[PDB]
Scaffold this active site. Sequence first.
Site, PDB file in Angstrom:
ATOM      1  N   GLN A   1       0.842  -1.334   0.003  1.00  0.00           N
ATOM      2  CA  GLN A   1      -0.152  -0.002   0.222  1.00  0.00           C
ATOM      3  C   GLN A   1       0.623   1.145  -0.150  1.00  0.00           C
ATOM      4  O   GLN A   1       1.759   1.410   0.431  1.00  0.00           O
ATOM      5  CB  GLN A   1      -0.805  -0.098   1.043  1.00  0.00           C
TER       6      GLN A   1
ATOM      7  N   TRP B   1      -0.043  -3.341   3.877  1.00  0.00           N
ATOM      8  CA  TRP B   1       1.160  -2.305   3.853  1.00  0.00           C
ATOM      9  C   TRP B   1       2.305  -2.819   3.475  1.00  0.00           C
ATOM     10  O   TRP B   1       3.087  -2.408   2.879  1.00  0.00           O
ATOM     11  CB  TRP B   1       1.076  -1.832   5.378  1.00  0.00           C
TER      12      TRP B   1
ATOM     13  N   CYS C   1      -7.014  -0.154   1.527  1.00  0.00           N
ATOM     14  CA  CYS C   1      -6.512  -1.319   2.119  1.00  0.00           C
ATOM     15  C   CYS C   1      -7.553  -2.501   1.669  1.00  0.00           C
ATOM     16  O   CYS C   1      -7.079  -3.601   1.758  1.00  0.00           O
ATOM     17  CB  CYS C   1      -6.599  -1.278   3.592  1.00  0.00           C
TER      18      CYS C   1
ATOM     19  N   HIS D   1      -8.877  -1.334   9.418  1.00  0.00           N
ATOM     20  CA  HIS D   1      -7.926  -1.564   8.491  1.00  0.00           C
ATOM     21  C   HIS D   1      -8.017  -3.055   8.047  1.00  0.00           C
ATOM     22  O   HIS D   1      -8.088  -3.981   8.823  1.00  0.00           O
ATOM     23  CB  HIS D   1      -6.616  -1.407   8.867  1.00  0.00           C
TER      24      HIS D   1
ATOM     25  N   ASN E   1      -0.791  -7.715   6.392  1.00  0.00           N
ATOM     26  CA  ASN E   1      -1.210  -6.505   6.191  1.00  0.00           C
ATOM     27  C   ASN E   1      -0.801  -6.022   5.014  1.00  0.00           C
ATOM     28  O   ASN E   1       0.348  -6.193   4.537  1.00  0.00           O
ATOM     29  CB  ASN E   1      -0.524  -5.795   7.363  1.00  0.00           C
TER      30      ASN E   1
END
Length: 321
Positions: free
Chosen positions: A77, A266, A83, A240, A264
Amino acid sequence: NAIKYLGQDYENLRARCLQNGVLFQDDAFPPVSHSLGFKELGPNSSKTYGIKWKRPTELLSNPQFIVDGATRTDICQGALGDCWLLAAIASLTLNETILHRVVPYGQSFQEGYAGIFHFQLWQFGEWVDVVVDDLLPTKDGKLVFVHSAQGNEFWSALLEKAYAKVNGSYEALSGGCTSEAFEDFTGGVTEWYDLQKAPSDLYQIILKALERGSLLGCSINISDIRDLEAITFKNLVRGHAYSVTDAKQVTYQGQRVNLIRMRNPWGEVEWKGPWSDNSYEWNKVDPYEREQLRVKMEDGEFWMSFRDFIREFTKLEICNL
Ligand SMILES: [Ca+2]
Ligand SMILES: [Ca+2]
């Protein structure tokens, strides 16, 4: 094989661009300020200062569409709250049938290149083919939005751009539900589970879902907007979307314990409690299970016990085939 989104035919546009020796420019999504956003990604937003739209050929010498497979590590991300979409793309990569429906074959920066790429998404009860040119938002030579852990890989950046195109802007992707992206990739209907009132056989439901190649995601619910993207003490992110990527058992203290793996989007910031990458619980499991399941890397992916999972996360989303 699919409906041409906005009347744009990939094969015909690619052929016309290749034969005439020109690069495709998408008239349905101009490389301008409006295409980035209006507020969060508006012209006055600090996150947009210095953004230049560039094709991957202008960023490095050897741009590639796909490197070492189209995998979940390719989803990291950027400066956008998408997300939900990214967690879905990461989950999508775990099912070959769905991955190859969404991302067609024969796309590259070498042979057959004409500055045009395409993806297939489910829209209005049918598969639609969406095209995009390869001009991507960059700042100081680096991608601003989704990028791969592999610097010269661009498929995920282009898929997220296709989503931005369908929705009007990149900012239209800020704030959403994993369910919708799951449905856009399968044509199914996502089921929600309240983890505070979790059924006794939920782990078995998760195991069967993952084996079939279903798309799974999870999140921690928030009550107010100021606690959005807030970090818990054990390093989980609230409000998230996470992708649920595996569920396996290990032998711990003489008993088979239920574990679950999530990622995640990210591509960093992981759980730091029991069963985390550097946690002591892994020292007590046998060498084979340790080596097959645990990967000591800041990659956004980690393990948790199913007991801790249902205590921390509040929502589980499962989209079956
Ligand atoms: Ca890759
Ligand atoms: Ca990790």
